[PDB]
Curated annotation (Swiss-Prot):
Originating species: Homo sapiens
Domains: entry comment: Must be membrane anchored to cleave the different substrates. The cytoplasmic domain is not required for the this activity. Only the catalytic domain is essential to shed TNF and p75 TNFR.
Disulphide-bonded residues: C10-C118, C146-C250, C204-C234
Protein name: Disintegrin and metalloproteinase domain-containing protein 17
Quaternary structure note: Interacts with MAD2L1, MAPK14 and MUC1. Interacts with iRhom1/RHBDF1 and iRhom2/RHBDF2. Interacts with FRMD8 via its interaction with iRhom1/RHBDF1 and iRhom2/RHBDF2. Interacts with TSPAN8.
Gene: ADAM17
């Protein structure tokens, strides 16, 4: 397979919710956007430099098309929910939403905009239970790159599963930027078709002395080991097949 430079970039709709704006953006558009621009660019370096077939099938990456900045909580009617509402759901007494329900709600609310982009990604600031940092569709044992309709019987409309989310809060504190970059890499990894690296394949889950785990390992990589910022051969095989199938459908030229 040969790369098409006219169809080698997955353009993103990046959404910063009110929690992200307040806690990460310090209530400023400049601070909020600079954080996301720099994070996406560092993630793009991991992707763009990856040779998916271990040869010349490289130069595939991600770029931001738009950053939506939600400065305040979404006003909701009684019984109505929205990913950007003030309260956490299902438990308002908790700092965070149930992560799966949040990804579902974001996908529902962002459906119209998501239909026009390769991927939509939510950046929030909430302490998900049991150390979870993000969630995404694709590479699950459907969804991922390029909007694919799913009729929601509950929602009564089509939603698109080209979505993921990252939280930069864990255990009551802001995560390191080196940690945040890896969360987003991991979530987009799922979007790109990669499943978790299994323990049973040494090639895909190396020991610490061997450079450590790759980004798709199910236990969040810290970023202090060499392999942490890279995709395993297992992830490359899965993503290679996805890119081959999906680039013509929704990838665009690098800006
Ligand atoms: C480096 O970031 C990572 C790496 C592994 C992770 N595992 N999890 C939990 C969960 C449900 N989310 C996800 O995308 N994969 C999963 O198993 C992170 O939230 C996570 C984040
Ligand atoms: Zn995962």
């Amino acid at each position: 397979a040969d790369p098409d430079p006219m169809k080698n970039t997955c353009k993103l709709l990046v959404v910063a919710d009110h929690r992200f704006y307040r806690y990460m953006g310090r209530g400023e558009e400049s601070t909020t956007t600079n954080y996301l621009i720099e994070l996406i660019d560092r993630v793009d370096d991991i992707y763009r430099n990856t040779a998916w077939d271990n040869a010349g099938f490289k130069g595939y990456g991600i770029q931001i098309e738009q950053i939506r900045i939600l400065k305040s909580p979404q006003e909701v009617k009684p019984g109505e929910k929205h990913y950007n509402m003030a309260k956490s759901y299902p438990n308002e007494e908790k700092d965070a939403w149930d992560v799966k329900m949040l990804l579902e709600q974001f996908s529902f609310d962002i459906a119209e905009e998501a239909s026009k982009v390769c991927l939509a990604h939510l950046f929030t600031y909430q302490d998900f239970d049991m150390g979870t940092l993000g969630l995404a569709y694709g590479g699950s044992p459907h969804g991922g790159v390029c909007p694919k309709a799913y009729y929601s019987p509950v929602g009564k409309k089509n939603i698109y599963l080209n979505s993921g989310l990252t939280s930069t809060k864990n255990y009551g504190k802001t995560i390191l930027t080196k940690e945040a970059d890896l969360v987003t890499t991991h979530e987009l990894g799922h979007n790109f078709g990669a499943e978790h690296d299994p323990d049973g394949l040494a090639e895909c889950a190396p020991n610490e002395d061997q450079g450590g785990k790759y980004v798709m390992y199910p236990i969040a990589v810290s970023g202090d080991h060499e392999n942490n910022k890279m995709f395993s051969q297992c992830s490359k095989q899965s993503i290679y097949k996805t890119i081959e199938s999906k680039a013509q459908e929704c990838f665009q030229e690098r800006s």
